[PDB]
Design a protein around this ligand. Structure first.
Ligand SMILES: *[C@H](O)[C@H](CC(C)C)NC(=O)[C@H](CC(C)C)NC(=O)[C@H](CC(C)C)NC(=O)OCc1ccccc1
Ligand SMILES: *[C@H](O)[C@H](CC(C)C)NC(=O)[C@H](CC(C)C)NC(=O)[C@H](CC(C)C)NC(=O)OCc1ccccc1
Ligand SMILES: [Mg+2]
Ligand SMILES: [Mg+2]
Lengths: 300, 300
């Protein structure tokens, strides 16, 4: 028992709107007086192979865009384009605009996605940005424009917007500055993700969660250097561990009295010998979707 | 890739309040003009071995209870007791009281828990009521009074309130009529859960999800009777499958064109031979925390 938890979605549930442009609808985000959404809303199905987005944007009028906030309609009074993100200026400021940052996350960092169908919040989940900058979500038709966020104290920290999805549940998308995570473009050509590696610092975090929760069977007497851990790690498609990642594990290392390079030696043996049919926090697999901070904020 | 998703927590986030009674605080739920919470709020630490809850309730005055809705204080004007649930009548009706039912769920049914610390929403997760009527949640100090719910169209369907928790993440609690799920009492004596069995109809649902998402490797040519499935099921600590459960799998059986007793024969072989180190929706384990309806509403 150790729950993967999403942030309560109340504050983002406010900010969600349905954006339409021809027979293409998806979700938008409404902060102060600007409705943010994927720019591919302005495409026909015919013209998604290689859209000239500026030429497509030029042929649209402020009144081409049907923004709905409920069963209510909204008044568009300025279309703009930042990178792969359509910023629609609108009439009526969002009363519900919480304190917020637009933030960019690094691979391995976690966030909550409010999954929405046609402007209507449907479900919330916690994920990590994979090292190849894809999201293993659910493949849901109509979920383009759904956003990822962290809630830091008062402040809704928006980090992600869904642009493209595969039947494998594999999503790609942008920050709210409209720049893709990873080597992705918003056109329908063949596109390779990098090799998807296991997020080593998150597995270590989750072995610290396992300890804090009274699972000690995997703790060995032994120890390792960062370099000799990384020799093994890379044999098993684990990200190399960095001194910066060793540092953010510090607080869990102190709480449990298990030095980071001791937990690394624990992880090395699990990799080199496997689980032996045995179980950690009732998982068959080593889990990499908890950050050190995810464990700290939950394990206190 | 297939996301376990919680309901968006907006509507429940409204209804959450901090209840205090001496040096004991936990969470309450505020629907119309009644603040519902665990009755053990009225106990001292000393008197939790076998509290006489009526005698404890009698010695308290309407003004003994500190109900807070934010940094705001609330005015209590009538304490009552339904079963293990304290119903506090208060001044100020909840503006945010959504459409709601108080509902009782059966074992194996799923719901969202809004986890709260001291009246403050902290996190949301999707779980199933285990067959032994416990919840594998996170062990979080201050999470007593957190509620489970399903959101059915307009209607927040409240089904669960957390009363007691173990370091194993194993929670027990009541419906909002204050009756425990399972053989549990709200006093600190030794208490055994039943044997925790695997929720067969949910595993079948999730094999139908796996098919709908293009994982076919486990589909065998063969078929079985409900009785001969149940012979095997009970060997592997699976709940017996009922004709009623065979019925609620019908819609997934139609969507995929795989008859329920064919998917049962698929499940039998996975039980009798194991996974062979192989993977279903990228899980080592057969998963039992999706209902048939969980799959339908998500797989369309
Ligand atoms: C939601 O994100 C929406 C889902 C569709 C099923 C409607 N996505 C798009 O509309 C998006 C339009 C732009 C970004 C091209 N297209 C995709 O997300 C596309 C969906 C498939 C199922 C049609 N994703 C995709 O396949 O990646 C591009 C690609 C094309 C050809 C071969 C490999 C990869
Ligand atoms: C939240 O639910 C809160 C958590 C505590 C850690 C504060 N629960 C209670 O206060 C509750 C009070 C009533 C229901 C007795 N007590 C428990 O939930 C208790 C927590 C332990 C960690 C003290 N749960 C428990 O242990 O079950 C009862 C028990 C007692 C002795 C032996 C086995 C089982
Ligand atoms: Mg786009
Ligand atoms: Mg109680």
């Amino acid at each position: 028992g150790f729950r993967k938890m999403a942030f309560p979605s109340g504050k983002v549930e406010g900010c969600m709107v349905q954006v339409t442009c021809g027979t293409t609808t998806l979700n938008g985000l409404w902060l102060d007086d600007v409705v943010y959404c994927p720019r591919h809303v302005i495409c026909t199905s015919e013209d998604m192979l290689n859209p000239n987005y500026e030429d497509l944007l030029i042929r649209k009028s402020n009144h081409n865009f049907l923004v709905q906030a409920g069963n209510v309609q909204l008044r568009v009074i300025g279309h703009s384009m930042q990178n792969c993100v359509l910023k629609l200026k609108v009439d009526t400021a969002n009363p519900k605009t919480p304190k917020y940052k637009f933030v960019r996350i690094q691979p391995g960092q976690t966030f909550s996605v409010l999954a929405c169908y046609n402007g209507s919040p449907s479900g919330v989940y916690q994920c990590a940005m994979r090292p190849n900058f894809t999201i293993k979500g659910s493949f849901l038709n109509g979920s383009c424009g759904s956003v990822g966020f962290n809630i830091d104290y008062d402040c809704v920290s928006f980090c992600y917007m869904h642009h493209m999805e595969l039947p494998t549940g594999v999503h790609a998308g942008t920050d709210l500055e409209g720049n893709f995570y990873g080597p992705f473009v918003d056109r329908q050509t063949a596109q390779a993700a990098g090799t998807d590696t296991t997020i080593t610092v998150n597995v270590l975090a989750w072995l610290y969660a396992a300890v804090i929760n009274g699972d000690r069977w995997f703790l060995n007497r032994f120890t390792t250097t960062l370099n000799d851990f990384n020799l093994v790690a890379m044999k098993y498609n684990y990200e190399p561990l960095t001194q910066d990642h060793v540092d953010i594990l510090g607080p869990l290392s102190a709480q449990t009295g298990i030095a980071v390079l001791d937990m690394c030696a624990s992880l090395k043996e699990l990799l080199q010998n496997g689980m032996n049919g045995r179980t950690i926090l009732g998982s068959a697999l080593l889990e990499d979707e908890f950050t050190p901070f995810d464990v700290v904020r939950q394990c206190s």
